[PDB]
Amino acid sequence: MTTTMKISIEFLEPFRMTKWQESTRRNKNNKEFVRGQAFARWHRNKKDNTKGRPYITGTLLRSAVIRSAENLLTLSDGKISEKTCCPGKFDTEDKDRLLQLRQRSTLRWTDKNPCPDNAETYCPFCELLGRRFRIHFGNLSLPGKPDFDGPKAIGSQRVLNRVDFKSGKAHDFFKAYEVDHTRFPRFEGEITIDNKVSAEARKLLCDSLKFTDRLCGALCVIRFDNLAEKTAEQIISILDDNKKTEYTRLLADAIRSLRRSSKLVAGLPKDHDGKDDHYLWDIGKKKKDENSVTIRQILTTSADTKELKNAGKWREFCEKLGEALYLKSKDMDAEFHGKPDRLEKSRSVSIGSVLKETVVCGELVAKTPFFFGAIDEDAKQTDLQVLLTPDNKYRLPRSAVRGILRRDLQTYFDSPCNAELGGRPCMCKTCRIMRGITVMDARSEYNAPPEIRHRTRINPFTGTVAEGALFNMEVAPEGIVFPFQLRYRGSEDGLPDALKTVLKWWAEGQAFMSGAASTGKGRFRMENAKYETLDLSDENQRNDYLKNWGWRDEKGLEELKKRLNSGLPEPGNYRDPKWHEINVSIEMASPFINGDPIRAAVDKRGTDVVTFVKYKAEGEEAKPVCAYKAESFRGVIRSAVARIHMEDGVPLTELTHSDCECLLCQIFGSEYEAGKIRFEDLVFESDPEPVTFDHVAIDRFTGGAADKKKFDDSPLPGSPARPLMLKGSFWIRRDVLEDEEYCKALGKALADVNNGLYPLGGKSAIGYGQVKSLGIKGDDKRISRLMNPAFDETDVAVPEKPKTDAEVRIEAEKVYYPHYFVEPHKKVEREEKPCGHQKFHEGRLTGKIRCKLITKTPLIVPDTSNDDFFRPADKEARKEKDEYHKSYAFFRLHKQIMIPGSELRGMVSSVYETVTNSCFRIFDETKRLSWRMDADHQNVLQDFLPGRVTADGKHIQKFSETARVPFYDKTQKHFDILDEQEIAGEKPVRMWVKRFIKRLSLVDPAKHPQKKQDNKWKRRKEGIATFIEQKNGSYYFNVVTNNGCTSFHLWHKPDNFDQEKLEGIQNGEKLDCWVRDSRYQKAFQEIPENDPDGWECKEGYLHVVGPSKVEFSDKKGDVINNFQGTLPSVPNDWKTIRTNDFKNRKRKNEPVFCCEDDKGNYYTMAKYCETFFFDLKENEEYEIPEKARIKYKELLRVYNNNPQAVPESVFQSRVARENVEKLKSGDLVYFKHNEKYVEDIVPVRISRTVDDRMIGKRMSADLRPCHGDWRHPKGLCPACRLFGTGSYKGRVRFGFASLENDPEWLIPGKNPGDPFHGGPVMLSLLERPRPTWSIPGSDNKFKVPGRKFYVHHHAWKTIKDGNHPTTGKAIEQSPNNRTVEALAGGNSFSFEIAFENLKEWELGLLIHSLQLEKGLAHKLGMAKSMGFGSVEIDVESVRLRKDWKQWRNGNSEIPNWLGKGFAKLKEWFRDELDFIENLKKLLWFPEGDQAPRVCYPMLRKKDDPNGNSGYEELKDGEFKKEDRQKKLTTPWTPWA
RNA sequence: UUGAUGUCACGGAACAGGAACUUGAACAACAUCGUUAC
RNA sequence: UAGUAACGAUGUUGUUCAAGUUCCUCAA
């Protein structure tokens, strides 16, 4: 007796879902069960396990149908078909149940009796209301009834908001679950209708089901009828197996950046030679063990797996791999929800019968990168995320659009709302329009990953970043189009005036929707707007509206979009939107950089930092453009404002901005209110191709390139020819331009920015940024009227340089050295506090210094961007893998000769820090030295005893003595009778050891007058002689000693003076002879067949080292000559090398081995013996500390890394041939000890000695790098206060020098008529410096000498011709020298030095270090150990700065500052200024007719035509060991 | 997997404040091997 | 009965980034 009607809803928007709670907090007292009643619920079976499906109750649909019936019943004057309708009853006497009452002001129609319950025929509204069930509503569930694994498998919980209006930041908040409509678009259920209900109530129910449009926060229409985890573990294992565990976060951040495309792995950077040993992309490979994969190979084999071929799979793989790597690198609340007021009776009111409908279509594109904060969980790498669709599409929710419409409608009026989330509906002017507005969501179909931006915060007391201020941010691209549709229904004749004015504001590109609007986030623009007004008051238009469910679905929308008229309606009352656009145009003159290190790590160029480049969308693809960030420009302008205004004493940079109405808190905003000025990005108006500049860090002592301190950067090029224009804009509020107090502050800040200060970008300390001019327009000269520059009276000329007094006596026929260190003082002061990069102090100076550089000796500043500049034409380009002869050009930027700022900065910094006796800026406090020890018994080789380490590496057992066993000889055989188990020293052997041999003579008393001048014949006694056999050269004898106690057999070779004693020997005569003992320390295996004497059989260890001591050469030495032809080849394995020739051929002295390899090398091998350690003394051992093992590790690292070694691997020692790295349990050791502690361990008899301390502990404690903590503390060296340091910005900025006259090269080019290119000159070897010549020994006597100032001379006239500076022979090219292009004397450059907050004694010393006296000169460039680079600097106008209006050129104040500087120099050091005298002696330039010949010595005296006693004769006598420091300190000591 | 005589939740902008920056001449002369003889 | 003395050859490149901060405030 029922009639089931099957219904089915279909969502067109992401609906919302509530949270599940147990059946105890399901009353009217919970504040989360209420406010969660208008959503869908989540039912889970088997409670306490999150597993179920969502559903929608029937009471919500019943309430919606009742509301739609009330709204539809008054539109036809209360008559459905024929009969009139009763008003209905909405009152209940019981109120302990019915958890929620109605506060709605029920509509009215035809007021009459409420049809009391005691009836027999009701009104159709009574039958629809339900007065066993009359109209039963069923639950809506999913079609197939599935079972999911929780509410986080179908949706995602996002946080909603409630912002304020005056202090427009926030209030409480709440959150809910929302499910997408593309995955769950359908719900099904039924309604059980009785038989005899009516024939007009069914029509009302059908029209009410067709009239309802939204159920759960969304529009609807009701119808009726494993690789990435293991890849992360493998990468982590690779990073842990090596020592590269500090590259993990950079690896995570650079791997996450590869999610844009899979064609980025085949373009990763390489080395500088094109190899595959990058410092982070090629970790894992070694010298051996080929089966070791790198990270590049892992990423290359994972890009094509037939699973990560799509974009989404590769994107997800990269995202979770970066998340896993970040999580591995890591370990190295109040929601005001509800409270609706329980009202007893609703105040029924009538609204009439006039109802219209307006549909506004169109779309809104983006003009700035937008942002919608949706920071979710399970992703902690970005910490500022955007809102995306489950298919990675960008969307804007309708809640943000509704809130922005509310804000704009409150702005159109002048009255904010006063609601408090409860009670009766509010009836203000902006809540009666907001109650008829319906909007929709968007998708934008872009589907691309968003870029990441890095932001910081700078401490305004030191100039660096603050502690703990560094964070990321991701923004959506620019140019994405969203579909738009607004629908309004009311009683007016169309749209109201407020909505028309707001839409006219939005059609002008002033729709600031959401995001970080203070830094120039999303600003949209509504385009292609259409509108059409319907009329639901009649019956021939309402039935056509109800026939097709309105026009909400896609088919109805495609039919409706053919009826809308174009163009928005004009408003009756305009309101002149309250935001004004101001354009900004900056023009530069120097390079520009905006750092981005992750992009430089991914880029294929192979640099360290690259400039910032943003993307923009063209509908489906992204294109990159270089720009300047908006946050950096906002920070620059904010710091320009904050440093001028005082606000009651302390400047705006020291305030906390807690509860103050400061000038920064009313324009730029704070954490309590929003700002009133919004900035934007700045494009570059062109296509600037980046260039690459190489840098280096030159050591102070032994001036050369320091370790691990080579780098480069890729800035955008700028020069005075092409000035790199910048274009941008920013928005200001309307009620700020009308104020006269804030516009003055903005004008002052922009005038201080225009006047040269505040450079934009990165490394401004070397001449980057340097804003040339700034011009704004679009404000009716309200701000651009204080931006006029001014001056003072500029006529006074600069004083001249003083005359010098330090002179030297240089004579002829003498040679000089080029190093001459400068010994410093012992008082480095650190008792002054730094100033602070805040407001401009009163008693300090700021301005510009214009200089003028002029060379007087050829200058070499190379362009290291490309080699082979002097390459011949019309030939092959280049072989892939070879070592050619490098050749460079001069430095050019835009085809213009220039000098960088870092060169001049380093030069002036060296002179200034050697004048004031400050801390050594850069140094190498590691790398302990080592020296080869001499070969002499008494001084060094007496203390080195033979030893052997025990079974554990803790003790060393010493031996008694040693004797040498002959190998590689021809008179024995020791290789084929001994295996490899006893020649490695791991098994003791048994040899026969002889100590003293006995020579023989004939007659002593008749030898006196011609011989016996060697006093060795003092131990002869007597001896009888026999004769048993005959030999060709010797004679056999049996000699007794004194009484016949023993007899020894020998072979005696006679001579001229003992040939008369024997004529014919008859085997039985008794000759007389004398026996003398001689030293003979040998040991054989079995016995020799020449000396049958008593050999003492001993027991000990035997060892070998290999054939060492090769005198290899290339010029057929004295031992290779006079040979017997056909020199053999080198054997491929040892233990078979024998003796070929003898060195002495009269006697049978030292044998050699001459051979020849495939090249022109000729080896001659000594060392026909090995050593044998016997008599191991037990129970006496010495401990090994850690210092000895550190020294041994250093010794092994020096032995194994040598470029001057023998090219053959067979003639090396055991240490270098087998590449050992530790000391084993039993091995060869020559150790040194004293009283149970060992000191030194050397492998061979004559090896090198490593010193105990490092080179940093050989100085004073004050001369070390003045860096560290000892606002900023007061412990800084005097040179790290003018120039910067770490955690302290320096207040001196240099600039690019530019040539103004004609080039005037050294030698003319190959093409006449083109005076812009020079000729090539070839230089000498230029080998690296040796710090082991200034510090000869290692005990305590040799401290670290000074700062290595090169002297001035003229030795470029010998290089220009083609000869050598030392000898006179012509130099020949090789893959070790260069061919540079140089300038000549008589060229002029010009640059500028900007300074700020300097004292009056620091400026005087800076001027004294810039310009020297009238006899000195500076020295910059390449190869200044010859005569190459001698410049002098004259200082022009020094115009100061005293206010933001006038600048007051101070040329007539120099002679005061200089004096004050010297006064300070007298205050610190009283009368101990000898270092300044030496520095003035070392900068002296030859004024005339003086030709000092300086050069480096050769190795010996036989390899130079002058015969000047090269380095091997200078180590004795003049520069022996104790006169080295003394002679190398005096500014001009003869080279001798 | 809801109760019926009463649900404005399309009744609420995840908003407000922050300079990828500080320091650094692309340069530069004396070392490398071990033993032989008495 | 013991351990003493210093000699012989002439050839050759190196660093390519290092030290810092990598999340907080206003709220709760």
Q: What is the CA radius of gyration of chain A?
A: 48
- Which residue has the closest alpha carbon to B28 C1'? A1328
Neighbour tally for A607: CB within 10 Å: 20
Find all residues with CB under 8 Å of A879, minimum gap 6, and list them.
none
Query: Under a CB-based contact definition with an 8 Å cutoff, are residues A1069 and A1146 in contact?
Result: no
Query: Under a CB-based contact definition with an 8 Å cutoff, are residues A1352 and A1417 in contact?
Result: yes
Task: Give the span between the Cα atoms of A46 and A30, in whole angstroms.
Answer: 24
- Give A1007 CA → C7 C1' in Å: 32
User: Which amino acid, residue A942?
Assistant: Q
Cβ-based burial of A537 (10 A; exposed 0-12, middle 13-18, buried ≥19)? middle
Q: Would you give the DSSP letter of residue A267?
A: G
SS3 A535: strand
Residue holding tokens 């007061």? A1274
Strand B contact residues in chain A (1215-1234), C-beta within 7 Å: 1215-1216
To the question of whether residue A220 is assigned a binding role by annotation, the answer is no
Pairing verdict, β A815-816 and A1493-1494: parallel
| Cα dihedral across residues A547, A550, A551, A555: positive or negative | negative
Residue holding tokens 């023998």? A1206
Assess whether A157 (CB) lies less than 7 A from strand B: no
| Concatenated DSSP letters of A923-945 | -------EEEPP--TTTTTTS-E
The whole-angstrom distance between residue A586's C-alpha and the CA centroid of its chain comes to: 29
Q: Which nucleotide is nearest to A939 (CA to C1')?
A: C6
Task: Give the span between the Cα atoms of A611 and A590, in whole angstroms.
Answer: 14
Closest by alpha carbon to A589, among A725, A442, A704? A725
Cβ-based burial of A1483 (10 A; exposed 0-12, middle 13-18, buried ≥19)? buried
SS3 A993: strand
Task: Give the span between the Cα atoms of A759 and A668, in whole angstroms.
Answer: 21
User: Which amino acid, residue A614?
Assistant: K
Residue holding tokens 């982070």? A280
CA distance readout (Å), A936 to A504, A516, A941, A943, A1245: 100, 79, 6, 12, 11
Neighbour tally for A1132: CB within 10 Å: 9
CA distance readout (Å), A495 to A438, A512, A565, A569: 13, 22, 15, 9
Task: Give the span between the Cα atoms of A341 and A408, in whole angstroms.
Answer: 29
Closest by alpha carbon to A1217, among A1102, A1330, A1110? A1110
- Give A1280 CA → C18 C1' in Å: 18
Task: Give the span between the Cα atoms of A1389 and A1295, in whole angstroms.
Answer: 12
Task: Give the span between the Cα atoms of A504 and A571, in whole angstroms.
Answer: 8
Find all residues with CB under 8 Å of A1312, minimum gap 6, and list them.
none
The whole-angstrom distance between residue A677's C-alpha and the CA centroid of its chain comes to: 33
Closest by alpha carbon to A437, among A214, A234, A120, A230? A214
| Concatenated DSSP letters of A96-147 | SS-S----S-----S------SS-SS--HHHHHHT---SEEEPPBB-SS---
Residue holding tokens 């070592």? A883
Q: Would you give the DSSP letter of residue A1325?
A: -
Task: Give the span between the Cα atoms of A1273 and A834, in whole angstroms.
Answer: 8
Neighbour tally for A1344: CB within 10 Å: 22
Task: Give the span between the Cα atoms of A814 and A655, in whole angstroms.
Answer: 69
- Taking the CA of residue A1000 as centre, how many other CA atoms within 13 Å lie in the half-sphere pointing to its CB? 23
User: What are the tokens at A321?
Assistant: 């791999």
Task: Give the span between the Cα atoms of A850 and A837, in whole angstroms.
Answer: 24
SS3 A754: helix
Task: Give the span between the Cα atoms of A489 and A306, in whole angstroms.
Answer: 54
User: Which amino acid, residue A414?
Assistant: D
Q: Which long-range contacts (CB under 8 A, 24 or more apart) does A1309-1318 make?
A: A1316/A895, A1317/A1381, A1318/A890, A1318/A1381, A1318/A1382, A1318/A1383
3-class secondary structure for A1335-1379? CCCCCCCCCCCCCCCCCCCCCHHHHHHCECCCCCCECCCCCCCCE
Q: Which nucleotides along chain B are within 7 A of a protein C-beta? A: 1-38
Task: Give the span between the Cα atoms of A1256 and A1260, in whole angstroms.
Answer: 9
Strand ranges (E), A311-464: 356-366, 437-438, 451-458
- Which residue has the closest alpha carbon to B16 C1'? A169
Neighbour tally for A994: CB within 10 Å: 18
User: Which amino acid, residue A620?
Assistant: E
- H/E run at residue A1297: strand A1297-1299
Task: Give the span between the Cα atoms of A200 and A206, in whole angstroms.
Answer: 10
The size of chain A, in residues, is 1536
- Which residue has the closest alpha carbon to B38 C1'? A1079
Task: Give the span between the Cα atoms of A215 and A38, in whole angstroms.
Answer: 8
Query: Helix A1454-1468 to helix A1402-1410 angle, to the nearest 10 degrees?
Result: 100
Closest by alpha carbon to A1437, among A797, A644, A498, A543? A797
User: Structural domain boundaries of chain A?
Assistant: 2-224, 232-330, 356-577, 599-699+708-777, 804-832+848-867+888-929+1256-1445+1453-1536, 997-1095
Neighbour tally for A860: CB within 10 Å: 23
| Cα dihedral across residues A32, A34, A37, A43: positive or negative | positive
Closest by alpha carbon to A11, among A207, A142, A136? A142
Task: Give the span between the Cα atoms of A368 and A793, in whole angstroms.
Answer: 48
Closest by alpha carbon to A1493, among A1353, A1348, A1326, A1364? A1353
SS3 A564: coil
SS3 A42: strand
Task: Give the span between the Cα atoms of A1367 and A1503, in whole angstroms.
Answer: 9
Strand B contact residues in chain A (1343-1402), C-beta within 7 Å: none
- Give A74 CA → C20 C1' in Å: 74
SS3 A634: helix
Closest by alpha carbon to A73, among A119, A106, A112? A106
The whole-angstrom distance between residue A1148's C-alpha and the CA centroid of its chain comes to: 67
- Give A937 CA → B38 C1' in Å: 15
Closest by alpha carbon to A915, among A853, A849, A825, A852? A825
To the question of whether residue A126 is assigned a binding role by annotation, the answer is yes
Q: Give the angle A353-A356-A357 at the CA atoms, nearest 5°.
A: 145
Largest CA distance in chain A: 173
Query: Under a CB-based contact definition with an 8 Å cutoff, are residues A517 and A731 in contact?
Result: no
Cβ-based burial of A210 (10 A; exposed 0-12, middle 13-18, buried ≥19)? buried
Query: Under a CB-based contact definition with an 8 Å cutoff, are residues A693 and A687 in contact?
Result: no
SS3 A389: coil
Core vs surface per residue A539-556: b (16+ CB within 10 A) or e:
eeebeebbeebbbbbeee
User: What are the tokens at A320?
Assistant: 């979770």
Q: Give the angle A1103-A1108-A1114 at the CA atoms, nearest 5°.
A: 170
- Give A1320 CA → C6 C1' in Å: 49
Closest by alpha carbon to A573, among A404, A427, A438, A413? A413
Q: Which nucleotide is nearest to A632 (CA to C1')?
A: B19
Q: Which residues pair with A1318 in a beta bridge?
A: A1308
Q: Which nucleotide is nearest to A705 (CA to C1')?
A: B27
The technique by which this structure was obtained is cryo-EM
Assess whether A398 (CB) lies less than 7 A from strand B: yes
Task: Give the span between the Cα atoms of A636 and A769, in whole angstroms.
Answer: 12
Neighbour tally for A1103: CB within 10 Å: 19
Assess whether A1190 (CB) lies less than 7 A from strand B: no
Residue holding tokens 């007391």? A461
Closest by alpha carbon to A1041, among A1020, A1060, A1062? A1020
To the question of whether residue A417 is assigned a binding role by annotation, the answer is yes
Task: Give the span between the Cα atoms of A741 and A739, in whole angstroms.
Answer: 6
Query: Under a CB-based contact definition with an 8 Å cutoff, are residues A1279 and A919 in contact?
Result: yes
Residue holding tokens 């934009």? A760
Torsion angles phi and psi, residue A1402, rounded to 5: -80, -30
CA torsion A719→A720→A721→A725, rounded to 10°? 70
Strand ranges (E), A515-578: 524-535, 565-566
Task: Give the span between the Cα atoms of A219 and A216, in whole angstroms.
Answer: 8
Query: Helix A901-915 to helix A1402-1410 angle, to the nearest 10 degrees?
Result: 120
User: What are the tokens at A1489?
Assistant: 């007719």
Find all residues with CB under 8 Å of A494, minimum gap 6, and list them.
A356, A358, A533, A569
Task: Give the span between the Cα atoms of A482 and A667, in whole angstroms.
Answer: 33
Closest by alpha carbon to A986, among A1012, A1023, A949? A949
